[PDB]
Amino acid sequence: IGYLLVKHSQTDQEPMCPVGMNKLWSGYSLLYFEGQEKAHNQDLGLAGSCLARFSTMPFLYCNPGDVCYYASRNDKSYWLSTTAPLPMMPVAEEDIRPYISRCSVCEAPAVAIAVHSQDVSIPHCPAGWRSLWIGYSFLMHTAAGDEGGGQSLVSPGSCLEDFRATPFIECNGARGTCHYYANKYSFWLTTIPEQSFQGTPSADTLKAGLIRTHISRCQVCMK
């Protein structure tokens, strides 16, 4: 049918398409744009989240007076990031490259979906569906102000192969720099101890280490 399977490497290297799936293009992992301090996201499981050409300011805007402005105000862009070390201070121009996650759009045989266990055990792909990869349940995010976004739990975009406390980076549009700010938050589905119904959550603060056994698992499947 020509379903588009999208993969984000979460590294500065392009991800390879599954054997039998021809690549339509590779690009940069786009999370969301922020214009007039209002976020507009791209579903990480849809081809729109894979932009062929990167820029700290990939868009422009116009007002009714037939006037348009490109990189002439205070807008931003957010991208999935790599394991590149948390920056000193903002990284500029060519120094940004190592931080932007890469992606590939592949023409697939059938539709792919994501399943979540909300458990430490990996969810089983439905009967008649095979596994393309396993990962962690990425639900939503916030950064500047309270702007942010989230993924569709049935979309492959809600299943990242690598868990990251901070899976994305912020780029200052007109300044041509990107950086990691303290208000960046990633939200993930939790591993629930109970089998099916958790009426009372047991609050807790998790340090680096126990973190992963606390993150829900997922699998991306295709018939």
Partner 1 sequence: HGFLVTRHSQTTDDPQCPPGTKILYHGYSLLYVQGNERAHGQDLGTAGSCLRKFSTMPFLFCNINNVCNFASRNDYSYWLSTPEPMPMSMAPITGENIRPFISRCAVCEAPAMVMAVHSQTIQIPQCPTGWSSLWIGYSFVMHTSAGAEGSGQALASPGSCLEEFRSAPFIECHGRGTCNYYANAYSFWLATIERSEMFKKPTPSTLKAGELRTHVSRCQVCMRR
Which residues, 82 to 121, sit near partner 1 by CB under 8 A? 86, 89-90, 92-94, 96-97, 105, 107, 110-111, 113, 115-119
Give the one entry of Cl ion, its own copies, K ion, none that residue 19 binds, where binding means its C-beta sits below a cut-off of 5 to 8 angstroms depending on kind.
Answer: none
Q: Does the footprint of K ion cover residue 213 (CB under 5 A)? A: no
Whether 106 contacts 9, CB under 8 Å? no
| Ramachandran quadrant class, 121 (left: phi over 0; alpha: psi -120 to 50; beta: rest) | beta
In the bound complex, what is the minimum distance in angstroms from residue 75's beta carbon to its own copies? Answer: 16
Give the one entry of partner 1, K ion, its own copies, none that residue 16 binds, where binding means its C-beta sits below a cut-off of 5 to 8 angstroms depending on kind.
Answer: none
63, 121, 205, 213: which one binds K ion (CB under 5 A): 63
Closer CB to its own copies, residue 129 or residue 163? Answer: 163
Q: Does the footprint of partner 1 cover residue 185 (CB under 8 A)? A: yes
CA dihedral 134, 50, 3, 159 (to 10 degrees): 20
The candidate with the shortest Cα–Cα distance to 167, out of 92, 54, 83, 73, is: 83
**47 three-state secondary structure:** helix
Question: What one-letter code names the amino acid at 55?
Answer: S
8, 9, 75, 81: which one binds Cl ion (CB under 5 A): 75
Provide the binding-site residues for its own copies, judged by CB under 8 A. 88-90, 142, 144-147, 175, 182-183, 185, 203-205, 207
Q: Which two three-digit tokens encode residue 57? A: 């300011």
Whether 135 contacts 216, CB under 8 Å? no
How many Cα atoms are found within 13 Å in the side-chain-facing hemisphere of 135?
26
Q: According to CB under 8 A, which residues from 34 to 93 bind partner 1?
A: 35-38, 40, 42-43, 46-49, 51-76, 86, 89-90, 92-93
Which residues contribute to the site for Cl ion (CB under 5 A)? 71, 73, 75, 173-174
